[PDB]
Amino acid sequence: PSAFEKVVKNVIKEVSGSRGDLIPVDSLRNSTSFRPYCLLNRKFSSSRFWKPRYSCVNLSIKDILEPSAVSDVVDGNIQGRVMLSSASMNVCILRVTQKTWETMQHERHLQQPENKILQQLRSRGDDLFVVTEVLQTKEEVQITKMVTIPAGSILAFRVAQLLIGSKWDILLVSDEKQRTFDFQGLYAEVKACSSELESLEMELRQQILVNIGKILQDQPSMEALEASLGQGLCSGGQVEPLDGPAGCILECLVLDSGELVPELAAPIFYLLGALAVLSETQQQLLAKALETTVLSKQLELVKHVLEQSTPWQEQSSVSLPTVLLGDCWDEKNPTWVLLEECGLRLQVESPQVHWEPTSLIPTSALYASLFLLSSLGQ
Question: What domain range is 61 assigned to?
Answer without folding.
Answer: 1-177
